[PDB]
C-alpha cells in the first residue's frame, strides 16, 4: 500500500474502523481493505483469527501490510454486497431465498464454532454475498476464542449490536458464547422474513420484547412470518440460554428441512 492502491469508496464500518473498496494502481484488481491506525492488541488478535479461517461461507482474507503505525487488512471483495441490501424494508425477501441464506449462515457459524471461534456481531451488514449469492460471514473485529484445547471459556464482555444481542448478555456477568451467536442468527432470520427488527433490545423495559415473551404473535413482525419458520424462531429466541435450541437441533427443524427451492 506504498501507493499501489486507490481508495474508491466506503464499504462500511466494522465494530472497529472502516473498510474501503481499493483498486490496485497496477493491475486494477478490486479488493476490500480495512485500514487501522495503531489498538495494537486487538488488531493483532483480529489478524490471528483472520489467518485461521478457511471455509466457503467465511470471507477470504488475503493478508496484511504494516506501514508505519497503520495496518492494512486485505480481503475478498463481495461482488454481491451485503445481505442488508437484499432485505426490502417491511417486506423481507422470498421465503426460499431466506431459507438458503439461513442454511449458509448456519454452515458458516458451525465452521466458526467448530474451530472454537465466536463471531459476536452477526447481523445482515456483516453477511456478504459473492457473484453466485453465496453468503460469507465477515468482520472479525469482535471475534474471540471460546474453546481452546477442548475447554470452553465463558465470555464476560458486552459487545455487538443491541437489536441482535441475546438477553443474557445484558444480564449475566459471564455467559456461554454459542447461544449468543444462535440468537443473533434468529434475529437475522426475522429480518429476512419480515424486513423489520422485532425490538430495540431484548430487555424487560422494551415493550416489544415483553410482547414476544407473552406470545403475541398476532403482532408485527411475527404476523408476517409463516407458521413453519415462526415455530423455528420460537425455539431460537428463547430467553434462557440453557433452554435455547442448539445448531444440531436447528438442523432437525421442520422448516429448516422443508423443500422450497430448485
Ligand atoms: C454495492 C457494493 C457493495 N459491496 C460491498 C462489499 C463489502 C465487502 N466486501 N468484502 C468485505 C470484507 C469485509 C467487510 O467488512 C464489513 C462487513 C465491515 C464492512 C466488508 C466487505 N461490503 C459491503 N459492500 C461490493 C461492491 C461490488 O458493491
Ligand atoms: Cl485448541
Ligand atoms: Cl432489517
Amino acid at each position: 500500500f506504498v501507493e499501489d492502491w486507490d481508495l474508491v469508496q466506503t464499504l462500511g464500518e466494522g465494530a472497529y474502523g472502516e473498510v474501503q473498496l481499493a483498486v490496485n494502481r497496477v493491475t486494477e484488481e478490486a479488493v476490500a481493505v480495512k485500514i487501522v491506525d495503531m489498538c495494537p492488541e486487538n488488531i493483532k488478535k483480529e489478524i490471528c483469527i483472520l489467518k485461521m479461517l478457511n471455509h466457503e461461507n467465511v470471507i477470504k482474507f488475503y493478508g496484511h501490510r504494516r506501514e508505519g503505525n497503520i495496518q492494512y487488512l486485505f480481503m475478498e471483495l463481495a461482488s454481491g454486497g451485503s445481505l442488508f441490501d437484499r432485505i426490502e424494508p417491511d417486506i423481507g425477501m422470498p421465503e426460499p431465498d431466506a431459507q438458503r441464506f439461513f442454511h449458509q449462515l448456519m454452515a458458516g457459524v458451525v465452521y466458526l464454532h467448530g474451530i472454537g471461534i465466536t463471531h459476536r456481531d452477526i447481523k445482515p451488514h456483516n453477511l456478504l454475498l459473492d457473484e453466485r449469492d453465496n453468503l460469507k460471514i465477515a468482520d472479525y473485529s469482535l471475534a474471540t476464542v471460546f474453546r481452546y484445547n477442548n475447554r470452553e471459556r465463558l465470555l464476560n464482555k458486552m459487545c455487538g449490536t443491541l437489536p441482535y444481542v441475546a438477553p443474557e448478555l445484558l444480564k449475566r456477568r459471564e455467559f456461554h458464547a454459542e447461544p449468543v451467536d444462535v440468537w443473533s442468527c434468529g434475529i437475522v432470520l426475522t429480518a429476512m422474513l419480515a424486513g423489520e427488527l422485532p425490538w430495540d433490545q431484548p430487555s424487560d423495559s422494551c415493550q416489544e420484547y415483553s410482547d414476544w415473551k407473552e406470545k403475541k404473535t398476532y403482532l408485527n413482525p411475527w404476523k408476517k412470518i409463516d407458521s413453519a419458520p415462526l415455530a423455528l424462531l420460537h425455539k431460537i429466541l428463547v430467553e434462557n440460554p440453557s433452554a435455547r435450541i442448539t445448531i444440531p437441533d436447528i438442523k432437525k427443524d421442520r422448516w429448516y428441512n422443508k423443500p422450497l427451492k430448485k
Side-chain angles (χ1 to χ4, degrees), residues 1-12 14-15 17-64 67-261:
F1 208 111
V2 176
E3 229 54 313
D4 281 333
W5 302 90
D6 195 21
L7 267 27
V8 159
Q9 67 191 259
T10 188
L11 258 10
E18 209 203 324
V19 349
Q20 304 274 250
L21 201 171
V23 182
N24 187 284
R25 285 185 163 135
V26 180
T27 329
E28 287 188 278
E29 179 200 18
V31 297
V33 198
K34 188 176 163 160
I35 308 146
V36 297
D37 191 1
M38 298 168 45
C39 167
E41 293 170 294
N42 295 344
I43 226 303
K44 169 156 114 67
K45 170 170 175 183
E46 188 178 352
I47 297 162
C48 275
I49 290 167
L50 286 172
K51 294 179 262 147
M52 289 163 83
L53 308 180
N54 173 37
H55 189 272
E56 54 201 311
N57 299 119
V58 164
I59 201 79
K60 267 192 184 81
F61 176 59
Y62 294 154
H64 61 116
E67 263 198 17
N69 283 106
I70 297 153
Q71 268 275 8
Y72 291 99
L73 300 185
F74 294 99
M75 283 96 45
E76 70 169 324
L77 179 67
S79 67
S82 63
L83 184 69
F84 182 92
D85 288 328
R86 308 301 179 87
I87 294 165
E88 177 177 0
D90 201 54
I91 290 285
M93 73 180 65
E95 198 176 304
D97 290 339
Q99 187 201 51
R100 172 168 177 284
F101 289 137
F102 193 72
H103 289 158
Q104 295 181 339
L105 183 58
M106 290 292 104
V109 172
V110 172
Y111 168 75
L112 295 169
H113 288 176
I115 57 161
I117 299 291
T118 176
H119 183 282
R120 309 211 280 189
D121 199 17
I122 298 172
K123 54 180 180 182
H125 279 121
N126 290 335
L127 296 174
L128 299 181
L129 276 338
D130 78 0
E131 66 299 332
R132 302 176 324 294
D133 278 359
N134 298 118
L135 179 153
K136 287 174 190 276
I137 298 171
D139 180 12
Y140 293 83
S141 71
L142 285 181
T144 198
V145 176
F146 81 91
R147 198 200 306 107
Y148 194 80
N149 292 152
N150 214 39
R151 283 247 74 211
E152 182 172 11
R153 51 186 73 188
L154 298 178
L155 304 177
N156 69 192
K157 160 197 186 304
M158 288 196 254
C159 59
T161 309
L162 281 163
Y164 295 90
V165 94
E168 57 275 24
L169 181 147
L170 298 181
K171 295 186 298 186
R172 298 195 184 189
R173 211 152 50 55
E174 301 190 316
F175 45 88
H176 294 272
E178 290 168 289
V180 174
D181 285 332
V182 169
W183 177 281
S184 56
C185 297
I187 303 295
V188 169
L189 180 56
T190 299
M192 287 196 291
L193 291 173
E196 75 173 299
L197 296 175
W199 42 69
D200 288 341
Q201 50 174 92
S203 76
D204 276 305
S205 71
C206 177
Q207 188 55 233
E208 287 72 19
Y209 184 59
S210 303
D211 289 350
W212 169 251
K213 287 194 287 178
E214 290 163 41
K215 312 245 284 161
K216 295 174 179 181
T217 59
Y218 57 81
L219 301 170
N220 278 350
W222 317 115
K223 198 205 178 144
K224 303 178 210 166
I225 302 180
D226 180 70
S227 66
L230 185 65
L232 175 55
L233 291 169
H234 275 292
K235 299 183 288 193
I236 298 172
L237 299 179
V238 165
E239 183 169 55
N240 176 1
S242 291
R244 192 176 309 149
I245 195 170
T246 65
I247 303 175
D249 286 331
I250 293 173
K251 283 180 176 175
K252 308 175 183 151
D253 168 80
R254 191 164 53 79
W255 182 77
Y256 190 91
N257 285 291
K258 175 170 191 179
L260 292 179
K261 194 172 171 169

